[model samples]
Target chain A: ERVRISITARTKKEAEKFAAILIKVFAELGYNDINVTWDGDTVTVEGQLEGGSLEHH
Target chain B: ERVRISITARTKKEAEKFAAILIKVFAELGYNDINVTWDGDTVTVEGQLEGGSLEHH
Candidate 1:
């Protein structure tokens, strides 16, 4: 399982660059709710999903 | 509707990871006539305005 994810880059632009895709995976593909936060140029994404295949059985 | 947007990322290859950004955001944020650019090691994006909103009008 993906416990958590943090992404950093040379610039905020580059950081946000990745944010969009990660957000899509969480919001669209993974069916997960997510929060994206940043400190200066760094970006972090926290996500939670329990639907579909990820659901507890 | 709002207007204008851009994306820059690492490598022409790296740009592949983020294309979904436009697909997700554009549906909600409102825009059109999307275009892209690559210069050596990074990608750049430009788009024209069309319709929609953060909350939809």
Candidate 2:
């Protein structure tokens, strides 16, 4: 029914902040499994949400 | 008709890998406009893809 497109950040804090902005910008209806990971220098974020406007679906 | 599910990674290469893994895990039908960004040791990846089974639509 939906899918999530994510952006990576420098830290856990950064990931949360970055993803938060996108959700707001996109006016996302909802999302699931907001997650993060770090390797040497960056943090990865991921989740599930509808990429299109809710009314369309 | 469809949506993309993505995952963030450390670099353009990393983001590509993560998103690809999700695509593989999900067996995504298709995707479009794969993109990435950089700021403070981070990268953002995004695109469009089918989230559900192709036949469902």
Candidate 3:
């Protein structure tokens, strides 16, 4: 599945933090070709979902 | 406020992944005295909450 997450924070610093965490989370799940970018105060994470679901269990 | 988060995953590796993400999340929020530990398939994060709310807006 294609996975895209956009995280908006009160500040750019916080947005960056969220982006980094999401990247780590997906990487831990064995995702590849991850791309991260920012727009205003929002940070985006895009990738192909693999190895795991983004579901809590 | 005191913040405590316990994440249970299917495996210890997944638990560690969740723990790391939570740690980064709290660190982004300016939390301090953070502690992370694991029990079986569960990971626990405990700390004093500061600087931000864990609320989505």
Candidate 4:
């Protein structure tokens, strides 16, 4: 599975900061292989889905 | 011929303002066919070049 994530900010710096935070959160959620890229004031996070177990809590 | 123009600002609004000013300046200089696009905090201007006359004053 694949997910498309985009975070936008007023400035590139702010966008990068949010990207870092997203990476941290995904890491804590057990996502190890993640791709992060920043273009202008937008950051994109792409990764594969793991465990095949989808549950909404 | 073509020209590349780019501008960055602290915010999207600021970037738009800068872009608008640039367009206005170009118009004042007699360049009417200027294209402006903004994404996030960056603005890009691209268009055909007019007059082979390139001289610095």
Candidate 5:
């Protein structure tokens, strides 16, 4: 099964920070399938994960 | 209770157009508390709504 992608940030700045953090974490974990982009006040992250899922409440 | 806020748009242009439409709708609905702003690919709308709610499917 394909792992779902998710982003969690309230503001653009926060999103950007989170994206950077994700990059570092993924690199440390030896995962290299992440992409991050920002459009004005929104930051979007897209990629595929081998395992794990996300849930929102 | 305050009405929950929601945004629905696929693209930046679409989001801006939707915001404009929302302004007209609010005016016709006797609502004066509507503010809209666009930043790059994202449009944000904030204000107060009285006596109505939105549902998503």
Candidate 6:
């Protein structure tokens, strides 16, 4: 229902690293409340888009 | 020295759409010289990161 992204990588560290950048990009685009869930080889990022993304969309 | 991105998608239109948004994100971050090369299922984005990305990096 909301914004979610699943990233897969070889290792937890790599997945988290990718997630950090993904989170940063989303944050820059206005997903400030984003949260992450870590699995063994996957990271799920979920958040709500507020007023900031309106300009781009 | 330059910024380049390679994106592969199922269709040219899809690749281009992805490129457009990727370009927009870079543009918003200040890469005005960005250019694109389309090759079948791949799109290559090349540009120079001038001043804008400095703040983020």
Q: Model 6, residue B30: displacement in angstroms?
A: 1.3
Instruction: Write the residue-wise lDDT of candidate 4 on B1-57 in tens digits.
Output: 444355444445544644565465556444569887666546676545466466655
Shift in Å, residue B19, candidate 2: 14
Error of 1 at B56 (Å): 37
Considering every candidate listed, which one attains the maximal TM-score? 3
lDDT of 1 by residue, A3-28 (tens): 23455454556557557766766676
Tens-digit lDDT string for candidate 6 (B1-57): 355555544456545544666666657646677888766546677766554334554
Q: How many backbone clashes does candidate 3 have?
A: 0
lDDT of 3 by residue, A1-57 (tens): 555555545566656655676677777666667897666655667777555556654
lDDT string for model 1 (B1-57, tens) is 222233344344434555556555544544455666555654445554475224425
Candidate 5: tens digits of C-alpha lDDT, residues B1-57: 221123434445434544565465446544567766555645555545455556424
Looking at model 2, the pairs that clash are B3-B49, B4-B49
Q: How do the residues A1-57 of candidate 2 rate in per-residue lDDT, one tens digit apiece? A: 323344343344534544554444334435545554546645434455544454744
lDDT of each: 0.53, 0.44, 0.63, 0.56, 0.47, 0.60
lDDT of 3: 0.63
Alpha-carbon TM-score of each model against the true structure:
0.40, 0.28, 0.46, 0.41, 0.33, 0.45
Residues B1-57 of candidate 3 have per-residue lDDT tens digits of 455555445666655755666676777667766997666645667766555655556
lDDT tens digits by residue: candidate 5, A1-57: 121123334565544544565465455544467676565655554444465344447
Residue A35 shift from truth in candidate 4, angstroms: 0.5
TM-score quality measure for candidate 6: 0.45
Which consecutive 10 residues in model 3 chain A have the weakest lDDT in total? A1-10
Interface RMSD of each: 10.5, 12.7, 8.1, 15.1, 12.7, 8.5
Question: Tens digits of per-residue lDDT for model 4 on A1-57?
Answer: 344356444566645654565465556656568897667556667655475343447
User: Rank order by lDDT, top first?
Assistant: 3, 6, 4, 1, 5, 2
Q: Residue B31 error for model 2, in Å?
A: 24
